[PDB]
Amino acid sequence: SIKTRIEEVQLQFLTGNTELTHLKVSNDQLIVTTQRTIYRINLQDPAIVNHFDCPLSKELETIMNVHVSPMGSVILIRTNFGRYMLLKDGEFTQLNKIKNLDLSSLHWINETTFLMGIKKTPKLYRVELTGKDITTKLWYENKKLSGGIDGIAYWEGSLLLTIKDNILYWRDVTNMKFPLVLPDESEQFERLKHHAIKKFDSYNGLFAWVTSNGIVFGDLKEFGKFLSSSKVLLNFELPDYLIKDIVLTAFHILLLRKNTVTMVSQLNNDVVFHETINEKFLGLVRDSVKETFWCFSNINVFEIIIENEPNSVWNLLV
Amino acid sequence: SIKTRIEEVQLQFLTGNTELTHLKVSNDQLIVTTQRTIYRINLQDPAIVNHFDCPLSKELETIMNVHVSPMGSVILIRTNFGRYMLLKDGEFTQLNKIKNLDLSSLHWINETTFLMGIKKTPKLYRVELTGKDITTKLWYENKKLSGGIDGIAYWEGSLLLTIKDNILYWRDVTNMKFPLVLPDESEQFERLKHHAIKKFDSYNGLFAWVTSNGIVFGDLKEFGKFLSSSKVLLNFELPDLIKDIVLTAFHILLLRKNTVTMVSQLNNDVVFHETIEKFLGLVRDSVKETFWCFSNINVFEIIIENEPNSVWNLLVR
16 A cells, blocks of 8 residues: 655755755755756755855856756756756866757766757757767657657667657667668657646656646557557546646656646556645656655745555556 | 765664574665564654564474565565465465475566576576466576576566576577577686675676676676676775675675675776674665665665766766
């Protein structure tokens, strides 16, 4: 039997005024940002709070996106003035080679490498960090399609992309011709036509994609029927029935709607948790190293504490 | 810069009399055993201690081996009288189909499935738990070789086995003929000829094998040269007999008499070496990526900070 509950996290360092804009958690390091400042706290020794003033030239410049490597070694920051910079061991490195680049999606493959989609065009690039700079390579383009890549998953050669209604799958890209153009398989699902924080998530080769009619999900870890074997959790399976965010756990899926969090089993669509928490909710967050889960608003951070997850589904794994 | 230290863990449930024999940690659940009792503690709430009395028929019967699934859902217990039983949600199920089986190695693939080697013979079997019982399938045999399988690693179809001096590798077993017999590649390294707690470990597709001259290690995540591309940390690279080995994300933990050494996988740098009653194992929580070591009286946490950050400059190609 699974036990879930939500607990507020005390963030004294902030002050009654200051507002949160992003949260990431990696390897027990909690990373919160305001408009201009990046705070790092070791959850094993809270009370030590480090902070890093983003070196923002200009007055109206603020932090727009925060991308953290799976294990927390690198923090890639984008400002609303198009500047990209690495924050590493307390120092910022500017990446002038991509100034003003507009991304629709970014997905880390490891501590030095990520895949990125450019907005409004179906092109995917692999980016490798060298320390001072980056190298690039075109992985995918198809001009017959339109829209930007919104969803990216990669596991051991297997690649998954979403572009509007299309989900595109390659079994193993590693010995194929580049750039990739036509996938091994593709499916169409009526897309979610409304702004969300995220409509797609992956973890451990697992993937989940929010669409108009429900969530499509599966597991890249496992002929011509991969996509067709995907599972769905349909809207009428959910309590009180717009999904703003999604995060995968080992065996469940976390969904943010307005101000409620729902937890649903990946094995049989069972709703195991559903709860409510001026204050606007801004994301669901996973620490992929520690397998902990979080959500946050413009004023607060909360931990979604899960107990007995594996034990609760063992009978269904056999 | 990496920060490592060792901290004793307070285990009140024990007291002066009874000794520890096994420790596993999985999904923040700490599992310690004595001769006859199994204790489970949630590290997030340590004052709640659950215990389970192993249903030991006979007086001289005690717990010999404890095998816990990667995420903690199942606890497989072997007694010194040959009995195998599952402990799950507070209840024991006997597995009479394998009573008196003698294993050289056991490696979990998932929460219901493990690979096992039988002692003194080069045969590997896949075992699947059904709840009440098991099913079996022969994965590998080769009668030309001798000794039991001592080391097993499996990642996404890739299989690694050690049999005495041989390390055997298959790229992808999933569409191959069973039983497996000849590997895609094989190498020989003079084996460690002395009892150890473990001579082989794997994690996240990473593998490490203690041999006479050093530790051979690598990464199944990545033609005909896989094994040859393995790295070595040689004995003369170490400060100052290796009894146990545990892989971390980017380092290797080694137990010797009563000292723990931590060595980098990326450049063999000794980043930690410290002394800490007989020491019985190194342990990893593969869900939480925490590390531990224990003796017959105490449990210690090996607390690591800044590991990824400490090696980032070396990850760049």
